[PDB]
Amino acid sequence: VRDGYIAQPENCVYHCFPGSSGCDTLCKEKGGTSGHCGFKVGHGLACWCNALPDNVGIIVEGEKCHS
Hints:
This protein is of the alpha+beta class. The chain has a single domain, classed as 2-Layer Sandwich (Defensin A-like), CATH 3.30.30.10. It contains one helix and three strands. The longest helix is centred in the middle third of the chain and has 10 residues. It is globular, with a radius of gyration of 11 Å. It is classed as toxin. Keywords: alpha-like toxin, scorpion toxin, sodium channel inhibitor, toxin.
């Protein structure tokens, strides 16, 4: 499983509300069993997840965010 900063997979980041509430809940439904905030310098403020399955996709850079 992955531990990374969580995004929406299109080379993006999420943004967090400092605490669990928002993207820790998103982390649960995406399937990470702890979720936190983070800052991913290169993008900006991001969320973080631990133990996401291989089918989840997260921050990438090489591109920049598109959706």
